[PDB]
Paper text:
GlcN-6P is then acetylated by the enzyme glucos­amine-6-phosphate N-acetyltransferase 1 (GNA1), followed by conversion to GlcN-1P by a phosphomutase (AGM1) and finally generation of UDP-GlcNAc by the action of a pyrophosphorylase. GNA1 is a member of the Gcn5-related N-acetyltransferase (GNAT) superfamily. Here, two crystal structures of Caenorhabditis elegans GNA1 are reported, revealing an unusual covalent complex between this cysteine and the coenzyme A product.
This modification inactivates the enzyme, which can be reversed with reducing agents. Further significant conformational changes have also taken place. The calculated difference mass of 777 Da is compatible with the theoretical mass of CoA (768 Da). Thus, mass spectrometry shows the presence of the enzyme–CoA adduct, in agreement with the crystallographic data.
Residue numbers in the entry:
A (entry chain A): 1 to 165
B (entry chain B): 2 to 165
Write the structure that this text describes.
């Protein structure tokens, strides 16, 4: 039904190099029925997420400002969501009330990999976050993904700490 | 106008800190208590005047999850001398879980090595656990390992960044 953010803000950022069966768009409320939770399960554990919790969380995200820019790719051949990536923006006071962007939950369906859907999403989100005015954008991942992330500007960084246990 | 609720902060503030220090949420009038001069000791604050401060503070105060910005005010100067933020990212993964990030940690240069930084980290790790976050992280510099290792944190280089 509804989109998690306005598809008009995303439109200028979507590249043009994907086959016509791919549609890049905001997550939508009825993407549960399009396999979104199955997609997330390929990334990590979804725990007890079910459709009611998915819809409630989707509403909470949809009313947030800055928006949760959760961008998906729907394969029109199957009408399933086959890729997802999130650009989440934290408001700051530093840098003149600037914004700090993070690219999270990046996943492409395992059968659909090496068709460029991953690069399309990271390119779209990097362009969206620059346009939004973010001063710093980051990705938490293993950069075995070296070739991949660097061509969009990301550099290895170790100014990040997690808990030991 | 407080950025988040003092009653939520209360159980996580450690005991018997010296009495010239008050640990509390960031307040809209903290601009007049030297908040910008404190943040400058962390990085460029740009042209953050009172009007822009207040516009941004209100945008953050109405966001859910809240921006858990905790500051320490010193009596002996009536100035904000320390600040740290716990910012919470909603997820769908982990049962519509939530991810906590400790950010913008800074103690005024004249007030360092009096445990203010430690109080802020203990407070925010305890508050993040209460909020039910499944993972918490810190962004800091590796040179400061002898500080952050005291609150469970260790360096994690599965991270990439760029400045625009
Ligand atoms: S932690 C953040 C990343 N998310 C995950 O790691 C979750 C699981 N992995 C994925 O969902 C996908 O494997 C990701 C990493 C999102 C990649 O998506 P795509 O497969 O759609 O990537 P592209 O087709 O756009 O790939 C472009 C370039 O990526 C490099 N590359 C991808 N995968 C590999 C592997 N497996 N081994 C070596 N290199 C890989 C290549 O430079 C690739 O260009 P090619 O023309 O495909 O060689
Ligand atoms: S996450 C940090 C990113 N922020 C900054 O880099 C901003 C500039 N730095 C600061 O604001 C302060 O130096 C920080 C890093 C916030 C620490 O604040 P405090 O000065 O209040 O620290 P504590 O008194 O709580 O220190 C507790 C123990 O941590 C170690 N420690 C603090 N500072 C250092 C330095 N610079 N180098 C090595 N260790 C440091 C000490 O073990 C300290 O215990 P002592 O009992 O003082 O030795």
């Amino acid at each position: 039904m509804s989109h998690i953010f306005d598809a008009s803000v995303l439109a200028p950022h979507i590249p043009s190099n994907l086959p016509d069966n791919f549609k890049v768009r905001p997550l939508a409320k009825d993407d549960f029925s399009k396999g979104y939770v199955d997609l997330l399960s390929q990334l990590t554990s979804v725990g007890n997420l079910d459709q009611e919790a998915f819809e409630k969380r989707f509403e909470a995200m949809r009313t947030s400002v800055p928006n949760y820019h959760i961008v998906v790719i729907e394969d029109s051949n199957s009408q399933k969501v086959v890729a997802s990536a999130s650009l989440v923006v934290e408001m700051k006071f530093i840098h003149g009330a600037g914004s700090r962007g993070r690219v999270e939950d990046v996943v492409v369906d395992t059968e659909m990999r090496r068709q460029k859907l991953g690069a399309v999403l990271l390119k779209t989100l990097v362009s969206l976050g620059k346009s939004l005015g973010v001063y710093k954008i980051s990705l938490e991942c293993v950069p075995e993904l070296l070739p991949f992330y660097s061509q969009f500007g990301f550099q290895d960084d170790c100014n990040f700490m997690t808990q030991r246990f």
